[PDB]
Amino acid sequence: NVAHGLAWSYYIGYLRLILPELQARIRTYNQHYNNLLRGAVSQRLYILLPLDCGVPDNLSMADPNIRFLDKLPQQVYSNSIYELLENGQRAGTCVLEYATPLQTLFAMSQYSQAGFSREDRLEQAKLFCRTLEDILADAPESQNNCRLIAYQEPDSSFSLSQEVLRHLRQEEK
Amino acid sequence: NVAHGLAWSYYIGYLRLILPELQARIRTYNQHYNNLLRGAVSQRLYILLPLDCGVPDNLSMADPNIRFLDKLPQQVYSNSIYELLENGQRAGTCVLEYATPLQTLFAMSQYSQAGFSREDRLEQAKLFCRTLEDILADAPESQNNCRLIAYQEPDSSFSLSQEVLRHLRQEEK
């Protein structure tokens, strides 16, 4: 039942650290990194939670319509702005990253001495989102600075860019 | 019951990574970083587990008889060699560090929305060592490359250097 510790550490040792000074680093990119143009990166941190726990080290490997734009300026943690493409053109920009602890779950199910099957993994990943949802709920302001994008995959097709673009548009209003 | 996830992640995402190429990086420091002298740093990774979960960011703050000697050479993870002093003179050298996840436990008990008392912390820290002991047992070779130094503190006095120097000598034979 590793999910509990996974969620607490991820909030306590990461989110609660970067999330407070988050929107600031963004308006800095949007308004103080250029003279000629205002940037339009969303205000929130988008966290990918594939319940499959696959974490490609390049999001273009997950979707060529997700392209790295720039590093979120600092103030040390490194974050990444991405543009999302739709029909060959930019539909949004946000800071985007995987929830790193899913790597632990993935790796746990590739390691014999753990007795960890794909079904264990899934059961644990879902548990992880729910625990994290709950922590962020009872955590002041934090829940508002970020949005959780949990998803699985069928056997049709799946667009990660469309998935993000949803919240990226559903938040414009 | 965060300890389980804490232990698995610490093994899966850290120990199982650095421990394999560990003794190599040490003999490199001991035999290939100098021409005139052979180094005498121990072969194992010494992991501090204060059940109090206090982690000072300088081990000289924990014990002035523990002094930073050098960074363990690489091959990216950074590690630290320490000399241990006894009566003003060097009694051993080893690579030494805290088990980082105890920070999560410490911080959890300083954060209201968690319902985490000192007693919760202790109960959880001990749980963490035991889980980690068990993982390292059923993990080939790994258990041999490292030694776990769990300890609490009274209300007499406690020497961290003496504690380490124990294993540092109990391993010489």
Minimal-distance CA residue of chain B relative to A131:
B2
- Residues from chain A that touch B6, judged by Cβ atoms under 8 A, are 5, 9
A–B CB contacts, 8 A cutoff, strictly below: 62
DSSP per-residue letters across chain B:
-THHHHHHHHIIIIIHHHTTTHHHHHHHHHHSS-SS------SSEEEEEETT----SSTTTT-TTEEEEEEPPP-----EEEEEEETTEEEEEEEEEE-TTHHHHHHHTT-GGG---HHHHHHHHHHHHHHHHHHHHTSTTHHHHEEEEEE--------HHHHHHHHHHHTT-
Among candidates A5, A103, A111 on the partner chain, residue whose Cβ is nearest the Cβ of B4: A5
Q: Give every strand in the sheet of B45-50, ordered side by side.
A: B66-71, B80-86, B89-98, B45-50, B146-151
CATH numbers and ranges of domains, chain B: 1-41 (1.20.5.5200), 42-173 (3.40.50.12100)
Among candidates A3, A101, A139 on the partner chain, residue whose Cβ is nearest the Cβ of B113: A139
Q: B100 near B57, Cβ under 8 Å?
A: no
DSSP A73: P
Residue B164 is assigned to a ligand binding site: no
Q: Return the SS3 of A148.
A: strand
- Residues from chain A that touch B143, judged by Cβ atoms under 8 A, are none
Q: By the CB < 8 Å criterion, does A111 face chain B?
A: yes
Q: Which of A66, A93, A101, A96 is nearest to A80 (CA)?
A: A96
DSSP A35: S
Q: By the CB < 8 Å criterion, does A114 face chain B?
A: yes
Please, which residues bridge with residue A90 across strands? Answer: A85
List the 36-65 stretch of B: residues with Cβ below 8 A of A.
Answer: none
Q: By the CB < 8 Å criterion, does B99 face chain A?
A: no
Rounded CA separation A82/A58 (Å): 11
- Phi first, then psi: give them for residue A27, nearest 5 degrees: -60, -25
Minimal-distance CA residue of chain B relative to A14:
B104
Cα–Cα distance list, A61 to A64, A97, A122, A161 (Å)? 6, 13, 22, 12
Min Cα–Cα distance to chain A from B99, Å: 14
- Residues from chain A that touch B104, judged by Cβ atoms under 8 A, are 5, 8-9, 12-13
DSSP per-residue letters across A82-93:
EEEEETTEEEEE
- Name the binding residues of A for 2',3'-cUAMP: 14, 100
Residue B82 is assigned to a ligand binding site: no
Min Cα–Cα distance to chain B from A46, Å: 23
DSSP A15: I
Among candidates A7, A9, A139 on the partner chain, residue whose Cβ is nearest the Cβ of B101: A9
Q: By the CB < 8 Å criterion, does A13 face chain B?
A: yes
Q: Return the SS3 of A97.
A: strand
List the 128-157 stretch of A: residues with Cβ below 8 A of B.
Answer: 135, 138-139
Supply A80's token pair.
């990444």
Dihedral of alpha carbons A155, A161, A167, A173, sign = negative
Method: X-ray
Rounded CA separation A144/B79 (Å): 37
Half-sphere exposure of B12 (CA within 13 A, CB side): 25
B9/A5 CB distance under 8 A: yes
Min Cα–Cα distance to chain A from B25, Å: 25
Q: Which of B32, B62, B47 is nearest to B157 (CA)?
A: B62
Rounded CA separation B37/B116 (Å): 50
- Residues from chain A that touch B107, judged by Cβ atoms under 8 A, are 12-13
Which element (helix H / strand E) includes A47? strand A45-50
Min Cα–Cα distance to chain B from A139, Å: 7
